[PDB]
Amino acid sequence: GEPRFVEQHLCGSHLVEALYLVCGERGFFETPRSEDWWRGIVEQCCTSICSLYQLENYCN
Numbered sequence: 009g010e011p012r013f014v015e016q017h018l019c020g021s022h023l024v025e026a027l028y029l030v031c032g033e034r035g036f037f038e039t040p041r042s043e044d045w046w047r048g049i050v051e052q053c054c055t056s057i058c059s060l061y062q063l064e065n066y067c068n
Contacts, residue, residue, distance in 0.1 A: 015057035023053055030060050031067035 018026050031037065049066060052058050 010061075012060040015059045015062070017057055018053040018063070019050075020054075023050070026053075026060060026063055027067075030064040036067040 012030075027037070049063075052066075053063060
């Protein structure tokens with residue numbers, strides 16, 4: 009029952025800070041992603057709900 013599996017609404021600064029926390033800047037985000045990739049993250053985490061663990065899998 010780890011808290012990182014609790015889904016929530018990641019919008020605005022919450023989503024930016026969550027990406028810095030679980031995905032980091034070095035590695036995945038060192039290469040710019042696509043606008044469609046960013047559309048899917050906002051859709052799955054801001055419009056819908058996603059967990060920090062689910063967000064980590066988007067960055068592999």
